[PDB]
Amino acid sequence: MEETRPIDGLTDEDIREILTRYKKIALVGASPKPERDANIVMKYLLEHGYDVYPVNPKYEEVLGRKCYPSVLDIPDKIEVVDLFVKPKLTMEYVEQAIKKGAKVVWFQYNTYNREASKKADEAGLIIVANRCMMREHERLLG
Numbered sequence: 465m466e467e468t469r470p471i472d473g474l475t476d477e478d479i480r481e482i483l484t485r486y487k488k489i490a491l492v493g494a495s496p497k498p499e500r501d502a503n504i505v506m507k508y509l510l511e512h513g514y515d516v517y518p519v520n521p522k523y524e525e526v527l528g529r530k531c532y533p534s535v536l537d538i539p540d541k542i543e544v545v546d547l548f549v550k551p552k553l554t555m556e557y558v559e560q561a562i563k564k565g566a567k568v569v570w571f572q573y574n575t576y577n578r579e580a581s582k583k584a585d586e587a588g589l590i591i592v593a594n595r596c597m598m599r600e601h602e603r604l605l606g
């Protein structure tokens with residue numbers, strides 16, 4: 465009998481390696497609204513040593529961090545693109561992630577897009593799908 469395994473096929477060690485090594489995060493869909501999940505996860509990641517660049521062309525600053533209108537506008541290397549936007553918006557952000565030389569595209573709950581995941585894979589990025597960075601951090605490293 466096999467148990468529910470994650471759709472992205474990554475082991476707990478694979479996720480642990482990502483969470484340990486890749487800490488330059490572009491958090492797409494960042495929001496200053498305390499009720500938004502993007503706000504909660506951004507606050508958590510900042511508390512745990514992540515360098516979190518908010519990405520949302522609507523805002524100039526989120527949680528005291530300069531907020532950028534695209535992943536490509538960030539003046540630093542970016543390792544993980546952490547997605548908090550609706551599925552169809554993720555295609556453009558994956559294209560930006562590829563151009564930026566990011567290593568990991570991370571689909572948070574309710575953001576998964578098959579075509580975007582396809583592009584990431586073909587470009588050699590790691591895909592994390594239907595997981596939360598905060599929940600995975602709490603579970604594996606907390």
Ligand SMILES: CC(C)(COP(=O)(O)OP(=O)(O)OC[C@H]1O[C@@H](n2cnc3c(N)ncnc32)[C@H](O)[C@@H]1OP(=O)(O)O)[C@@H](O)C(=O)NCCC(=O)NCCS
Binds near residue numbers: 496500548553572596
């Ligand atoms: C994807 C998700 C954000 C959709 O929720 P929703 O209520 O429909 O919200 P919307 O997508 O309309 O808007 C969310 C934010 O996206 C931002 N957004 C919209 N278009 C954007 C774009 N092109 N680029 C960057 N951000 C954008 C908006 O500004 C908005 O923030 P605001 O409310 O401060 O303006 C929601 O399902 C998400 O929170 N999923 C992740 C949940 C989960 O992983 N939580 C973890 C808990 S452990």
Ligand SMILES: [Ca+2]
Binds near residue numbers: 556559
């Ligand atoms: Ca494009």
Ligand SMILES: [Cl-]
Binds near residue numbers: 472
């Ligand atoms: Cl996938």
Ligand SMILES: [Cl-]
Binds near residue numbers: 522523524
């Ligand atoms: Cl604004």
Ligand SMILES: [Cl-]
Binds near residue numbers: 528
């Ligand atoms: Cl704020």
